[PDB]
């Protein structure tokens, strides 16, 4: 299995898990993971604000509170970039860009970056999304 | 603060690029990975992967004149801690980049900084973003 293979599978699996069950998303994160995500709780704009959440239990509470919204997330994935990083060059840095929307909303351009730390499997240690004005 | 470290890093990174491309590589770890504008090759540009400080220096040095002409509007910064003991810093920047006399290109760029008081860049990826329309 190639690094490109695992990055493509990772991203596809991550976004589809949002559709299928937001309450189990946190399982794929390290216990001490950092998330910077779409602030669904916040109060036209072609960007959205984000919020920082740290630790798997908090990440779970965040996704779970926003279950209905998270289930409705959709995207066009345009680009993927990766490099190895971290201890013994065994972790993986991934950057994705595309256009994200939710059922019935306009699109928002985004870039999202992840760091995957190996256990056969990987845990997400970092996950940052940034919306970009067109 | 971490926000201060990130802002200082970004300013210094792009400014050292203006002042001396042949010294840029020393801000990178010996085994760093770079994915940068492929100067050796539309509102996007191709990028190239370069590995290790020696090859990163060869890259910046061969492209010295072009590298010196790089300019940007920095719109956004995001950061998190990462890596061993949560001591490394993951940074994402977005903005609009150009070079003397060129049109702008929308970009996102990510860095990871590993503690050396100082930090070495272990990872640096740029991606250009094409317009929605």
């Amino acid at each position: 299995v190639t690094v490109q293979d695992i990055c493509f599978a990772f991203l596809q699996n991550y976004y589809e898990r949002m559709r299928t069950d937001p309450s189990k998303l946190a399982y794929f994160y390290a216990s001490t993971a950092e998330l910077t995500h779409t602030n669904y709780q916040s109060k036209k704009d072609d960007v959205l604000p984000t919020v920082k959440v740290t630790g798997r239990e908090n990440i779970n509470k965040f996704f779970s509170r926003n279950d209905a919204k998270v289930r409705s997330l959709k995207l066009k994935l345009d680009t993927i970039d990766f490099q190895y990083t971290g201890h013994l060059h065994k972790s993986i840095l991934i950057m994705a860009t595309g256009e994200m929307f939710w059922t019935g909303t306009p699109v928002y351009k985004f870039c999202q970056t992840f760091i995957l730390l190996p256990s056969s499997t990987f845990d997400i240690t970092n996950d940052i999304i940034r919306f970009i004005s067109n | 603060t971490v926000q201060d470290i990130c802002f200082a890093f970004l300013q210094n990174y792009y400014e050292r690029m203006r002042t001396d491309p042949s010294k840029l590589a020393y801000f990178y770890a010996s085994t760093a990975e770079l994915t940068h504008t492929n100067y050796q090759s539309d509102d996007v540009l191709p990028t190239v992967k370069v590995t290790g400080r020696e090859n990163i220096n060869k890259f910046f040095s061969r492209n010295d004149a072009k590298v010196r002409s790089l300019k940007l509007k920095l719109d956004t910064i995001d950061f998190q801690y990462t890596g061993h003991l949560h001591k490394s810093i993951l940074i994402m920047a977005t903005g609009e980049m150009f070079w003397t006399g060129t049109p702008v290109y929308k970009f996102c760029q990510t860095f990871i900084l590993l503690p050396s008081s100082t930090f070495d860049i272990t990872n640096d990826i740029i991606r250009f973003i094409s317009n929605s329309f």
């Binding site: 072609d46 995207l75 306009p106 | -």
Partner: peptide, 25 residues
């Protein structure tokens, strides 16, 4: 790539024009 995830090209196209329409509002 591009990959449509949790959606179709047609649904995406609708969201895209929605954005343009708001941009021009």
């Amino acid at each position: 790539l591009p990959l449509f995830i949790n959606t179709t090209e047609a649904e995406f196209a609708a969201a895209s024009v929605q954005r343009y329409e708001l941009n021009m509002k």
